[PDB]
Symmetry: D2
Subunit: 226 residues, 4 copies
Amino acid sequence: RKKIEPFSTLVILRHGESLSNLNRTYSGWYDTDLTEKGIEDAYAAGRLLKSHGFHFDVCFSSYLKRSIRTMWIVLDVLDQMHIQTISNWRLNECHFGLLTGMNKEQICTTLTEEELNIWKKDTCLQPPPCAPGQENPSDDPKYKDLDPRVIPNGESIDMMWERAKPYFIDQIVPRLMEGKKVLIVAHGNVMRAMKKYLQKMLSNGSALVFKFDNKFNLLETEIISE
Amino acid sequence: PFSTLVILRHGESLSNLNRTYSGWYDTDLTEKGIEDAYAAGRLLKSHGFHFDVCFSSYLKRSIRTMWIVLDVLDQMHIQTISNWRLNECHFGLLTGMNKEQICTTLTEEELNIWDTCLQPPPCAPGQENPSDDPKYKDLDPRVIPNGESIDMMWERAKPYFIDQIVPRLMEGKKVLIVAHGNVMRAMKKYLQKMNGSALVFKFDNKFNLLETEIISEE
Amino acid sequence: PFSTLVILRHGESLSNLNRTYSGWYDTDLTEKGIEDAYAAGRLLKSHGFHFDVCFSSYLKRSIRTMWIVLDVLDQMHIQTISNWRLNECHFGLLTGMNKEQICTTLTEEELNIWKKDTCLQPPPCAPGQENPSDDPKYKDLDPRVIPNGESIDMMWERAKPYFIDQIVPRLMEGKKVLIVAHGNVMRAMKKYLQKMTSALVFKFDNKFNLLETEIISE
Amino acid sequence: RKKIEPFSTLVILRHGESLSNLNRTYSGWYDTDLTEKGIEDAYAAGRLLKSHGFHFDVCFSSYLKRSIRTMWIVLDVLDQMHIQTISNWRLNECHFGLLTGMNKEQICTTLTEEELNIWKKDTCLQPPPCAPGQENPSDDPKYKDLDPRVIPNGESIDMMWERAKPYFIDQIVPRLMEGKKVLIVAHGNVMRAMKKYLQKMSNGSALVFKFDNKFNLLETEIIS
């Protein structure tokens, strides 16, 4: 038994556990690395993609180490360490501004009850910028070449998607229109935003598979799991 | 200066001569517009500009201007890059109309606001829509505009400026853009925090704007 | 066909009209050469070609032919790439000579091998002779790689990696590729693709097997 | 004390110990991975470059895992995991053909005494192709998009350089001419051929080449 292939395919995976996630603080652009569990998560995701026979032409990540390292591990499992990889800040998680590094108690002190409800249930609430004296992740040398005016400092999910969307349209879509299979190793908020965009509208270790025809009609969205 | 950006406007198109609004309608240069391009190339040549790369929109009147300018500059070999995000506003319903028909279609209040925020209506049923051109067949159909205000035009041109132009200036390159007037004005307004004339922006290695000069044969 | 490659020779240049050998000397198209390019475009249009990308050499006669062809095809927006590795042979000392002068500069045996073979390497440019490679358009190249007197075999040895690295991967992606080329380069590519010892059309399957070679003319 | 910087810089590193190297067999294109010692070698190379202050704009590797993995480790140590990375078969080690997988005893019986001397002291001796029934590393799906006629099967060092040189000229020089700092994580034969080319001629050491805006070589430095 064999299945007719689509003209192009986009697979999106979430990165695994990071050190902040284990410490129960918000990272955003704070460049927290994978834990040992998060490294195992990446091996498991590679094995999941290998068992489905995926061969990618290109892989995208954000500028954050948790995503880049996940990508490297997954490509190792897939025997695809040689393929073209592309990293870009537009795929970063939201920049949480003042909330960077906060735990639950600190978030609860900073936001009112109504704000905290909106932050959990909606995508429109914007955090304040980093405070004077607070370490701002965007001061990292990896961002030294960006237009300083574009660099976010406190971003709602909606704002994050407004600066990720042109990257998806300008770099990922043209490759799908060439008939490529594309992998993206993403942050959860970015992955959900892309899914909503594509569908016109998920377990921790699940992957999303989007299949397209040669006119970029969406033919299928499949969730794959262990 | 560490880097330099030159922006030039294309010359007269046939719709402009006929006094109709084109937007994405792919009107070509007149013979006068062709001479405008030769004049612009001679102006840049007299100022000694050598470019590493030239950008245009997907509209022929911009592409053709670029080709003529590079020819005058003896730079026909340099990398050229064309992209829809540098296109003029898509005028939707108003596409192809003259000044009188804009008056009959928009109210006195509509034309009064016609500022940078007024979004024209989309192309009417049966109206030829310039975005149905095969040159756009590879774009994400969701992103294609149908009636754009200048504000909306800039919202989709700005990411291209930030992702393609700024990184080349940050590398120390000399960049030419052959642009539409509205796009040129939005870029000037962004950079400054606000016929044959060109704009020359000079930057240091931190992307501070050191100076803007307007050059002309006069 | 899974993929298609079209190779076209550039139109007449000024050196061909005054009957001298150009090589890298950057002679432009004549008025007849301009008409040659319009006719080539009309031929490709009548056969329904739509390209994803066009290649040229760094020499004006090739670039200008490419631009005219794309104009006729209504494909002025597509990606174009120009590169020195597709240049004609650099004729060194023989650059700018006519047939009488080459007969005077080369021996009887040498003149015979140059016409019947592809292995004779001309001497380098003489001291005081204007060398076309001192053009600023080559200022970014590794100076060690720049030829000075090239046989046809030597030209192919430096064009071949470019063909393999930039043209073949696009054909393996299923693209339609146009190359505007110089005659010796077009012949070398034909010989490579067919394994042998006015446009060419090569049609391939998805493992890069040549299914058919067609010669199209008006 | 601050030193005036060059217009552009190329750093070339060699990958560390592979499993074939530990087992004393020739690999070539055989896609042998790093050992745990070669992984430590890569961490040390990263620390060396870190201690010298290098920040790269781009990194190149071959298509072989031992080079790619070394690149990934070095960039991790450098905190440069985000930078552009490019892999290409033209930077691969020689394809050793028939000699792929052989140990010193098998090489000695395969080659005559004159051949062996030339093999050691020169760069012109070409090995035969892979035999029928021998696994040929170029049958890997990673090479499926290549023109089948370009794929080597037994290369001398001279032939390896003839196919690597165009990549150096067409991909690495243009970036240097833009003023970039470029890292290459390479194989020893490839590194030596580049040095010979650039100059016109220890374990863990790196080579640093500095250029002006006309691509004049200004300095070759060995760091360790």
